UniProtKB/Swiss-Prot annotation:
It is found in: Secreted. It comes from Staphylococcus aureus (strain NCTC 8325 / PS 47). The gene is splB. One of its GO terms (biological process) is proteolysis. This is Serine protease SplB. The active site is at H37, D75, S155. Belongs to the peptidase S1B family. Serine protease that cleaves specifically after the sequence Trp-Glu-Leu-Gln. The keyword Hydrolase applies. Induction: Positively regulated by agr (accessory gene regulator). One of its GO terms (cellular component) is extracellular region. Keywords: Hydrolase, Protease, Secreted, Serine protease, Signal.
Length: 197
């Protein structure tokens, strides 16, 4: 099922950020992940909003300071933001006080239930977070395939397991199956190198 997120300012939803019409999520200090197909539309200096709710409340508005695409076929891009918010969140100006990074799941298997969390319906200045659930269909190398309903606004969605641990990043749907990048060692390493320090 696909359900509107009741509280966008508690964990794990405090790990999600909104671009104008796609999603990303927090991986470390001043650092978010999304798809190359989303960040190709952005530039350094553009804004993202941390965990917005329906009614103009959020974890602050932050300016992108760097965009680092993963060198590989996989649809993964690292975005760093300026630590000091353009507009403060409720925990003040510092990005890192307002958001919560995810931790990697140990792995994932066909049959297990995952959640895809993002913004599948856009609006005139209104972000609504949804959570979509469904079983994993397979995992091979850097591909994780899941049957859970998504829309183009889910570009860049974290994919989480039952325990809210990170199993992949959503990038594509059909038309049915939807497709995320699974975090292989090679990909985790590029992310670790490129998290702000």
């Amino acid at each position: 099922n696909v359900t509107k997120v009741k509280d966008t300012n508690i964990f794990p939803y405090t790990g999600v950020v909104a671009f104008k019409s796609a999603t990303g999520f927090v991986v470390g200090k001043n650092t978010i992940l999304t798809n190359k197909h989303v960040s190709k539309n952005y530039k350094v200096g553009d804004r993202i909003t941390a965990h917005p709710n329906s009614d103009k409340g959020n974890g602050g508005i932050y300016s992108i300071k760097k965009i680092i695409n993963y060198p590989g076929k996989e649809d993964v891009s690292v975005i760093q933001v300026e630590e000091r918010a353009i507009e403060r969140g409720p925990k003040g100006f510092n990005f890192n006080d307002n958001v919560t990074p995810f931790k990697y799941a140990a792995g994932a298997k066909a049959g297990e239930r995952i959640k895809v969390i993002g913004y599948p319906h856009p609006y005139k200045n209104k972000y609504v977070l949804y959570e979509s659930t469904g079983p994993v269909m397979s995992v091979e190398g850097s591909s994780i395939v899941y049957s859970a309903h998504t829309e183009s606004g889910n570009s860049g969605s974290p994919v989480l397991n039952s325990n809210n641990e990170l199993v992949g990043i959503h990038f594509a749907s059909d038309v049915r199956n939807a497709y995320g990048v699974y975090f292989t060692p090679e990909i985790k390493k590029f992310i670790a190198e490129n998290i702000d320090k």
